[PDB]
Enzyme design. Structure first.
Site, PDB file in Angstrom:
ATOM      1  N   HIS A  61      31.952  25.736  43.133  1.00  0.00           N
ATOM      2  CA  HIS A  61      32.619  26.997  43.465  1.00  0.00           C
ATOM      3  C   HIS A  61      33.321  27.562  42.220  1.00  0.00           C
ATOM      4  O   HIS A  61      33.239  28.778  41.968  1.00  0.00           O
ATOM      5  CB  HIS A  61      33.657  26.780  44.573  1.00  0.00           C
ATOM      6  N   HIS A  91      42.289  26.378  37.883  1.00  0.00           N
ATOM      7  CA  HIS A  91      40.922  26.851  37.892  1.00  0.00           C
ATOM      8  C   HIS A  91      40.974  28.357  37.716  1.00  0.00           C
ATOM      9  O   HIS A  91      42.060  28.939  37.750  1.00  0.00           O
ATOM     10  CB  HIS A  91      40.200  26.499  39.230  1.00  0.00           C
ATOM     11  N   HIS A  93      38.836  32.272  38.654  1.00  0.00           N
ATOM     12  CA  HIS A  93      37.863  33.098  39.353  1.00  0.00           C
ATOM     13  C   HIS A  93      37.465  34.203  38.399  1.00  0.00           C
ATOM     14  O   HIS A  93      38.322  34.718  37.680  1.00  0.00           O
ATOM     15  CB  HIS A  93      38.482  33.709  40.613  1.00  0.00           C
ATOM     16  N   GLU A 103      41.114  38.039  41.835  1.00  0.00           N
ATOM     17  CA  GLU A 103      41.360  38.010  43.279  1.00  0.00           C
ATOM     18  C   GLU A 103      42.469  38.985  43.668  1.00  0.00           C
ATOM     19  O   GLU A 103      42.206  39.916  44.465  1.00  0.00           O
ATOM     20  CB  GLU A 103      41.667  36.586  43.724  1.00  0.00           C
ATOM     21  N   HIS A 116      44.466  30.307  38.243  1.00  0.00           N
ATOM     22  CA  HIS A 116      45.350  29.804  39.280  1.00  0.00           C
ATOM     23  C   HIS A 116      45.794  28.422  38.817  1.00  0.00           C
ATOM     24  O   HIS A 116      44.942  27.489  38.767  1.00  0.00           O
ATOM     25  CB  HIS A 116      44.587  29.715  40.591  1.00  0.00           C
ATOM     26  N   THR A 195      42.662  30.737  48.758  1.00  0.00           N
ATOM     27  CA  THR A 195      41.726  31.860  48.756  1.00  0.00           C
ATOM     28  C   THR A 195      40.291  31.383  48.969  1.00  0.00           C
ATOM     29  O   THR A 195      39.360  32.178  48.869  1.00  0.00           O
ATOM     30  CB  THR A 195      41.823  32.707  47.477  1.00  0.00           C
TER      31      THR A 195
END
Ligand SMILES: NS(=O)(=O)c1c(F)c(F)c(SCCO)c(F)c1N[C@H]1CCc2ccccc21
Ligand code: NA
Ligand SMILES: [Zn+2]
EC number: 4.2.1.1
Length: 257
Positions: A61, A91, A93, A103, A116, A195
């Site tokens: 992911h 991590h 996104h 996000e 994050h 999330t």
């Protein structure tokens, strides 16, 4: 299983995880004009001097950098928090294009990525207990914009080709997360959620106002990762973000202006 594609992406998650339509889901759009300045909010205390990074892992992911959280070595406190929260992992996104990937959004503006840093409240004794509690996690969110390189990010980017596919890991010691912070710790804060599934409503979100800048080459290296495992067909790991969710009965508070 759940993911970020057409058939299993965020719009599908509620069928397995009904809390996807819950009262305090993340991320959200931060409307900078309607965030309430709270003069009683304390400065954030980021104490990362004794951080022990262990490993970096592609989980299919995103990729996670994991820390030793068995003692108070890298902690977040102060700000809107009452407890001491221990850094467990960070991590990111990111997008397929520099115009999307974060996000949270700020006045509907998306950034190229979002970091994050995930911490858990040490009164609950471990991360798995903390996620079952409304005050269990504190996630420090930092936006990335594309411009000048971030030197503190380069050790991360350089190891990515060794964890290209789902399930790969590598030793990742002596990484200092202070290298990823911007100059200002001014922030917004609101109660929300993880999330990704299980989307648990256990997060105090603290989102820094000031982005960090990363280079186009640094973010391009993120988009070379793969969602699939080795020897499966290539699916580039891009667009692993959840869109903004309704704010519902919540107010975002600002530590500044
Ligand atoms: N944005 S976030 O903090 O919700 C998050 C993500 F969005 C992620 F994509 C991942 S990748 C692993 C997914 O199973 C996260 F670990 C976490 N965080 C960790 C925090 C530990 C945990 C437990 C269950 C799910 C996720 C997570
Ligand atoms: Na460039
Ligand atoms: Zn995240």
């Amino acid at each position: 299983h759940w993911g970020y594609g057409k058939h299993n992406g965020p719009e599908h998650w509620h069928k397995d995880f009904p809390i996807a339509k819950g009262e305090r889901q993340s991320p959200v759009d931060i409307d900078t004009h309607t965030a309430k300045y709270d003069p009683s909010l304390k400065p954030l205390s980021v104490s990362y001097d004794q951080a022990t990074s262990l490993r970096i892992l592609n989980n299919g992911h995103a990729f996670n950098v994991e820390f030793d959280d068995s003692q108070d070595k890298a902690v977040l406190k102060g700000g809107p928090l009452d407890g001491t929260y221990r850094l467990i992992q960070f991590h990111f996104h990111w997008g397929s294009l520099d115009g999307q990937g974060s996000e949270h959004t700020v006045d509907k503006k998306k950034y190229a990525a979002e970091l994050h840093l995930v911490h858990w409240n040490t009164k609950y004794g471990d991360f798995g207990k903390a996620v079952q509690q409304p005050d269990g996690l504190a996630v420090l969110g930092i936006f990335l914009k594309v411009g000048s390189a971030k030197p503190g990010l380069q050790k991360v980017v350089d190891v990515l080709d060794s964890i290209k596919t789902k399930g790969k890991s590598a030793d990742f010691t002596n990484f200092d997360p202070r290298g990823l912070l911007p100059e200002s710790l001014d922030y917004w804060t609101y109660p929300g959620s993880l999330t990704v599934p299980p989307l648990l409503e256990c997060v105090t979100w603290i989102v820094l106002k000031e982005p960090i800048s990363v280079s186009s080459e640094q973010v391009l290296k993120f988009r070379k990762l793969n969602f699939n495992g080795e020897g499966e067909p290539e699916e580039l790991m891009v667009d692993n973000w959840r869109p903004a969710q309704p704010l519902k009965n919540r107010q975002i508070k600002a530590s500044f202006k």
